[PDB]
Every structure is written in structure tokens, then in C-alpha cells.
Design a protein around this nucleic acid. Structure first.
Lengths: 96, 380
RNA sequence: UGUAGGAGACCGAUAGCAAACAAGUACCGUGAGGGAAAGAUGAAAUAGUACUCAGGAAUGAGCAAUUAAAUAGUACCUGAAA
RNA sequence: AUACUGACGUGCAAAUCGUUCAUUUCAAUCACGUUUAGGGGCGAAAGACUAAUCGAAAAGCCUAUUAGCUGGUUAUUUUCGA
RNA sequence: ACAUCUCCCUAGUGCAGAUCUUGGUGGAAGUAGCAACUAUUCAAAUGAGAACUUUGAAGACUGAAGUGGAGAAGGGUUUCUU
RNA sequence: AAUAAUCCUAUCACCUUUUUCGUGAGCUGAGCUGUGAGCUAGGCAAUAGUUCUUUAACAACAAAAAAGAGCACAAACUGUAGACGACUUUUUUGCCUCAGGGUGCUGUAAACAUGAAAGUAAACUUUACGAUCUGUUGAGGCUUAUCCCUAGUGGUAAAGUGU
């Protein structure tokens, strides 16, 4: 099992969807990408991250977000994905 | 009763069905015809459309309104990795058409060639061409002798080298090329000697030649009749729609008379564009490949920021006059004219004044990054 | 017509009174009014499905079980055709 | 409720919905109660309206009205036959 | 519970059809469709099971001519707890 | 010069005695054996009570001996494709992911100036207030989603199905 720190460009993900559904769909893409990364159907998603994304309304995303993913057993197996607070995302490559 | 006012029908009947092509690769319908006096030579070549640029050219055109004065013209650029010949095909004339007798292969083949046969190259044990790894040279010679004796048309099995390209695909396109010229024996000697070598476009073509262009068009899916066929749009008042169809027609036939315009596929059609002049055959190792007698300045063909969705030119290339069917990145098939074109324009020898290398993404003026930097100056 | 008998070369549940029945009801109509569909397990349920197992439950299955009989289990006689 | 002869036209609706448009201090609009009933009422007249009903409402009956006209009018073989 | 051809009386006595009456049933078809009214997300709890239950956090909307309060008609235990 | 009114061609079961010619196989051109065809000599067979197909042809399959020699679909990725299938791709000399650079697009961010600014008021020349503008500042932001380059970062599962 593993804990990783990644940077998601939300802008590319959010591109195709209408204003009303941008932030919900981006959240769905976040769960989908995290699932894909950790190989987990059960992706438990931070309310604080959602709030951080949704804070300038559903009409627009943050361009770039740093997410922390934790793969956790308790067969059964899930991940927890959560917000990381930082000023800007300049040069912030992915890491474990 | 007859129509009150006459007006030509919408679109050509002769290009029904307006449907998808069954291959990505262009398909040559017919090859150049007999010329025993001419020496054996290749008829065709596949290359990849990289994009478009514009040119400045000096014009002769006797008695023209423009006449002596210089023109600016659009042109296409086609990156052309050298094709490799891997097989020989022997065809024989029958009242049922041309029939293959046999094919003779090279003494080794590329991985890229083998990749085209495998649907799952990654998850396979790659056993193709391994019993047929080798046979006696006597067997090969007998087949060649047999083909000379009985066959009356020779084609060479050639393939593309996509490994010399930036494209996602790693599968080669494999292709027959008819050889036109002298005796079957002289042709056979020519193909055998050429075989394992790589063929630049300069080995096949000359600049200033008029060339026939074979390609599948850019897609669009299933479209309405207005888009597909260009009919006059419906009135402002309608019960339903405005891109909605006209009347289909008469009660007799008691069936839809097939000549009516209809909704359906638009683009991804096979098409032959004819008589495109070669303005330059470029060289891979030339760093002056965009430059001219007027310019005389070191400068590669590659645009500022490169071609859209293709970037840098790194191999030999064909600079072709005017438009070419299909998407950028698409393979494009060049064929020699079935009877060589004879015209003023065909005979004429191009003198370029300028080849643009400005951006094709935004309105980026600069020919070079160096020019852009020179304009702007110091940076943080 | 009301009540009481006695009847039949009458009908046999789409018939016979609208009504074999919790029907002049339900139900519909502002109202005057209009007005249905609707019977049968077995001899005996003081024989009406015990018990076990798998089921979240419904249910299902059973080496288990009533009956002469359960593709006889109460939407139960027979069970046609589509 | 003027127009888009708009949307809708097996509807959200047996006349709705959208946009446009007319009305808005009086011959105004609204409520409740009340009056006038079928060849009758009532009508700023269109034969208008009088409970999804109108050049004569609804209910019941004379009535199973009448119809030279429309439709339908049920097993078999044999004989003579327009 | 069933026959009579032994003879003979009697009749609500013979159906493919009537836009037949009545009842059931198909093909059409897993189709038409479930399009008024700007939008939901995350986490938790309950439970067999949660897009549309409940709780919380967000995002939003109604926007005092309110999906807010009150009352009349009309309905009538629809209320409320369990 | 009647051309199919022709030519070919079947029907000498046996075994055994004798003489010849064609062809295949084993041995070290040749000899022999086999096979096919003939000649020479013998005495040796058949048989169901009268007809009711004369099983006689072709091809396929099952058993028994003897001998011979992995793909595709899916999944992810793609987007030259696309209503959906289908099509184009790639799946570790890759790909996805971010990040950097290129290419651009916008137009000079916040922050700070005891900078400038139409005037204003309050000290005994000084101190307050002020839309705005200039400077630091071609700044700040954004650029693959269907942009280009990068062997720069971290990633790269299911393991199913048909044959």
C-alpha cells in the first residue's frame, strides 16, 4: 500500500462540460482519475477539496490542484484522496 | 408538368455512394501504361501530409495580365521518409483480368513490416515470417525465372518507414508499386538490384513534375442534406425544420428515385486530385532547405513552432503546389500521370522568391526564434 | 301490487328478475336521474399445509407431510381456444 | 387575447404553454347572495348563451316510433331451375 | 351422471363474418415515451439495499405581486404520534 | 471428303509343366525377384431346381494399428474516426501523467514609491485627506482539451473470453 502526492490539471479535464455541470463533472473526473491511479473502485473524496474547488462557484475550476492519495486495506481495498494547501503549482511534479 | 425555371442538379450522381472508405491508405485505381522505349522505373510513392505554407514565385506566363510580375501562392508540404522495397509481385494477363502468379520476398524484413500483420504485437510471440525465414536460393531463382517467362506486369511490394516519424503509429503501410518501362527481364533486373535499398522521393521524382494525388478525405460523420449536397435552404415559414428535406419526387416510380439528395456520411471518401506541380524536393541534411536565390540565408523548411500537430521536419520532403485531400498527419499517395502531361505549365521550371516559415499557430510573424528574440531583447 | 301456498315438456350463471352475492349496492351524474362487475376445494378442513434446510425478506427446495387425490393449497371443480 | 397562421397538436391542456399585443378610473373589474326556465328565458345581435350539451338544454316515457333505404341474416347431399 | 336409430311429439335448435354483442388476447413494442419550472456535490447515519431517506458540510435557488404567513368556498381525519 | 455409318475396346476363372518381351524393387551396369503381357502342356472348378436390382458407382464419417510435425477478441491508450457499432492507433526504443522549454494569446498583476495628480483642511513654511496617472513592469495571467518539443517527474492495471 502507498501514499502519493500528485498534481492534477483540472482545466484539461473540465474542458468539454457546460457551466452548470463543470464542477460536479470535474469532481467525477477527480474520482475517476484517482481510481485509475490507485486501482481502486472505492475512492473516498475530501469535502474540503470539493469546497476549495467550488469556492469561486461551479462556473469555473482551479487550473491546477495538488491532491494526496492514500491506498488503504481496511478483497476490500480503497483509497482516500484529499486537498493539499499551497500558494501556486509552479514546478510541482508528482511524488511518493 | 415541367419546371417553370431550369436550374442544374445539386451534387454529382457519379460519386454515389457517399460512404466511408474501407482503408486508411490511398488506393491507386490504375497505373501508367506501356512505354517500352523508356527505361524501367517506379510509378508511385506514399508520404505524410505535414501541412501547408505559402510561397512567393516569379511568373513567366506569356501574354498574361500578370505576365512577368511575381505571385504569392499556397502550397502543401509532405514529409517523405524513404520507402523500402521488400517483395516482388508477378502478375499475368487473363480474360478475367490481372492475376498474381507468385510473390518473391527479400532475405530479411523490418519489425515495422511485421507489426502491420500483428493486431497484438505487444502480447504475442511474433512468429510471422520464420518458416519463410529462408529457402534455397535456387527456389528464389526458379520463381524469378518463372515470373519473367509468364508474367506480363511487374509490381514491387514496398513499405513505409514510420519509425522515422513523430506519429503515434508504429505499423508500416505496405504497398504495391507498378514498374513501368522496358522488357520484363530488364524490369526484373532493376527491381532485384534496387530491392533492399531505401528510396528517397528524389530517386522517384524530379522537381517541376505534375503529379496525381490519391487520398481519403477529412471526416465529418453523418450529415444533413444541406451540408451533404448544398440544396437551397427551406423558407422562413415551415411546419417543421429548416435543414429538413425538400420533396422526394414523383408517384412514378412508386419508390424513391435514387438520384434524390439524402442525409448520410460526408467526408472520409476516396478521391483523386490531378496534375499537382512539384515546386521543390527537399533534402534532409540541408539546413538551408527553406531558402531561395533571393533569400540566401540559413533556414530550415520547418515553420516557426513547426507544422500544426506534426512539428519538425526531419526527413526529406515534397513541396507541392496547391491543395491535398485528407487531414494533416495523413498518408498521401503520389502517382505519376498515366500518360505524361504536356502543357506550358507542365514544361515550365519554377523559380521561387520566398518560402514562408512563419508561424501557423496564431499570427506569429517571425521566420526564426532568433528573429523573435532579436525583436524583443532582454528578459527576466 | 303486498303476503302465503302449490307448479312447470321454463333458465342453468354472457341465461334467467337489473340483482343465485353484503345489489337497487358499488360506481357515475349539479340534480331529476343513470346503474354494474360479482356463485362452486374436499366426504371430512373438529383433515386448511406441521417440520427441516437455503434465503434480509419474499419465497424456494426437501430424506420431511395431510388427503383416495395437492400440475386438489382458499386468485382452490373441470380447465377449451386464442 | 392582436400577432408570430409561434411552441404544442397519442398535449402539461378534449383550446395548454411561450413570446408579442390590447386593457388599467370607469358604460371599470371582483366576490357573495339574488332574479328571470325550454319554442321558454336572457342576448352592446354573433342565432349568441342558458353546467365538456343547443337553428330549440338535460332527465324519463309514449317507443321495440317510423324508414320504398344501408348493413348483416347460421349443418349436409340430391332433384327441377329463372 | 349418461343414451335411445324403437316410435313420436315439442322447441329460445345448428354461425366466420353484422365498423355483430360480451369476454379474453396478440402483432404493432421493450418501441412511442417518462423534455414547463437555471444545480447539485461531498461526507456520515440508518437499513437487506440509498442519485432522488435522514444528519452535517458546501454549492445554489424562492427573492415579500414569495414554492412565506393567514383566512372564505370546497374537501373531511387528509392532521398528529406510534 | 457417310463426317463416331469410325476407331479404340471388352469375355482365353484354376493351379501346375515349358519358352519370350516391357517395367518397378532389394543387393554388389549386371544378376535375381515382384508386377504387366504372351506362348506351351495337362485335368480341374461353377451348379440353390422359372423372372421380379445384376448390391458391382461416387463421396463422407467411427474404431483399430502403422507412419508423419499459437493467434484473435477483450482491457486500458488513441482520435487522422465516430449517433452507436465500426474505423485509426499505442500498450515499456512506448504510453499516460504532470512539469519545463518552444509556439503563442492577452496587455502591463498584486505589492510598494516621505512618486505625479483637479482641488480639499489644520498646524506654527510642516502635517493630513484625493477619482486618477507614472514608475518598479512587454508586467501578471493563460497556451492541449483535437498545439509543438523533452529517454525531465511520477505512474503503466484487468487477466477475462473465442478459437
Amino acid at each position: 500500500p502507498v501514499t502519493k502526492f500528485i498534481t492534477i490539471n483540472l482545466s484539461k479535464l473540465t474542458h468539454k462540460v457546460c457551466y452548470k455541470r463543470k464542477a460536479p463533472r470535474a469532481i467525477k473526473e477527480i474520482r475517476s482519475i484517482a481510481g485509475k491511479l490507485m486501482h481502486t473502485k472505492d475512492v473516498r473524496l475530501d469535502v474540503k477539496l470539493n469546497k476549495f474547488i467550488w469556492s469561486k462557484g461551479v462556473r469555473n475550476p482551479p487550473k491546477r490542484v495538488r491532491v494526496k492519495l492514500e491506498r488503504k486495506r481496511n478483497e476490500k481495498m480503497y483509497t482516500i484522496v484529499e486537498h493539499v494547501m499551497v500558494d501556486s503549482y509552479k514546478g510541482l511534479v508528482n511524488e511518493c | 408538368s415541367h419546371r417553370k425555371f431550369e436550374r442544374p442538379r445539386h451534387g454529382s450522381l457519379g460519386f454515389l455512394p457517399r460512404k466511408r472508405c474501407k482503408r486508411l491508405r490511398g488506393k491507386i485505381r490504375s497505373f501508367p501504361k506501356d512505354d517500352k522505349e523508356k527505361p524501367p522505373h517506379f510509378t508511385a510513392f506514399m508520404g505524410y501530409k505535414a501541412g501547408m505554407t505559402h510561397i512567393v514565385r516569379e511568373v513567366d506566363k506569356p501574354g498574361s495580365k500578370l505576365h512577368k510580375k511575381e505571385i504569392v501562392e499556397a502550397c502543401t508540404i509532405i514529409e517523405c521518409a524513404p520507402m523500402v522495397v521488400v517483395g516482388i509481385v508477378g502478375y499475368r494477363e487473363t480474360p478475367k483480368g490481372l492475376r498474381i502468379l507468385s510473390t518473391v520476398w527479400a532475405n530479411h524484413v523490418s519489425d515495422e513490416f511485421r507489426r502491420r500483420y500483428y493486431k497484438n504485437w505487444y502480447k504475442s510471440e511474433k512468429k510471422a515470417f520464420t518458416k519463410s525465414l529462408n529457402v534455397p536460393e535456387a527456389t528464389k531463382n526458379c520463381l524469378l525465372k518463372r515470373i519473367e517467362k509468364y508474367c506480363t506486369v511487374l509490381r514491387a511490394i514496398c513499405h513505409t518507414q514510420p519509425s522515422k516519424t513523430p506519429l503515434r503509429m508504429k505499423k508500416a503501410h505496405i504497398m504495391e508499386v507498378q514498374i513501368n518501362g522496358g522488357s520484363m527481364k530488364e524490369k526484373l533486373e532493376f527491381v532485384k538490384e534496387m530491392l533492399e535499398k531505401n528510396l528517397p522521393v528524389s530517386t522517384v521524382f524530379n522537381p517541376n513534375e505534375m503529379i496525381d494525388v490519391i487520398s481519403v478525405t477529412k471526416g465529418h460523420g453523418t450529415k444533413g442534406v444541406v451540408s451533404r449536397y448544398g440544396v437551397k435552404r427551406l423558407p422562413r415559414k415551415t411546419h417543421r425544420g429548416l435543414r429538413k428535406v425538400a420533396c422526394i419526387g414523383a408517384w412514378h416510380p412508386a419508390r424513391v428515385q435514387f438520384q434524390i439528395p439524402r442525409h448520410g456520411q460526408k467526408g472520409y471518401f476516396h478521391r483523386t486530385e490531378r496534375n499537382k506541380k512539384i515546386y521543390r524536393i527537399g533534402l534532409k541534411t540541408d539546413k538551408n532547405s527553406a531558402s531561395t536565390d533571393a533569400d540566401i540565408t540559413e533556414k530550415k523548411i520547418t515553420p516557426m513552432g513547426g507544422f500544426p500537430h506534426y512539428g519538425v521536419v526531419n526527413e526529406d520532403f515534397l513541396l507541392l503546389k496547391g491543395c491535398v485531400a485528407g487531414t494533416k498527419k495523413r498518408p498521401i499517395t503520389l502517382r505519376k500521370n498515366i500518360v505524361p502531361q504536356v502543357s506550358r505549365d507542365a514544361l515550365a521550371q519554377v523559380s521561387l522568391k520566398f518560402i514562408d516559415t512563419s508561424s501557423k499557430i496564431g499570427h506569429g510573424r517571425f521566420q526564426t526564434s532568433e528573429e523573435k528574440v532579436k525583436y524583443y531583447g532582454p528578459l527576466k
